[PDB]
Amino acid sequence: PGQFGDIQSRTPESKDVYANTQLVLQRPAAGTVHVPYSQAPSGFKYWL
């Protein structure tokens, strides 16, 4: 996560996808139905 290669596939068209974003579901704010989460930013954007 946060590094180049966080999401990978063998070919652009492939349905076989590896990902490691450390996505964690968090408790919603009281009175709301929104779904909060903690996730690393794309390693691709950082690399660029």
Binding site: Q26, P28, A29, T32, H34, P36
Partner: protein, 105 residues
């Protein structure tokens, strides 16, 4: 100018006489247009974007724009240990001070 109460109108001095004007023409600006949260008499409450100047103005009964600009350093204090530019949907809640819309004075 007739001393009645009308939330849609403001009155201003014109030479030697009071005159009416539309409240819709009232604006507050700094580095960008400010949001007015409420008004009464000589006091205006507004939330302004960060900037080094502050100005106010309105359009009069003759469709002439009037404004006044003063220098003013506007850079709100940081609440908590993070510097953010907008209110989040989820987060922690900390003590702060605000102006109440109440006119009890």
């Amino acid at each position: 100018t007739d001393d009645s109460h009308d939330w849609t109108k403001l009155r201003y001095m014109d030479n030697h006489m009071p005159a009416d004007a539309e409240r819709a023409g009232l604006f507050v600006r700094t580095s960008a247009p400010c949001t007015i949260t409420g008004t009464m008499g000589h006091f205006i409450l507004a939330r302004c974007p960060k900037g080094e100047t502050l100005t106010v103005g309105f359009t009069d009964s003759r469709k002439i724009s009037h404004s006044c600009t003063h220098p003013f350093h506007h850079d709100p204090p940081v609440i908590g240990r993070e510097k953010f530019h907008s209110r989040p949907q989820h987060g922690k809640e900390l003590p702060c001070s605000t102006y109440v819309q109440s006119t009890a004075a």
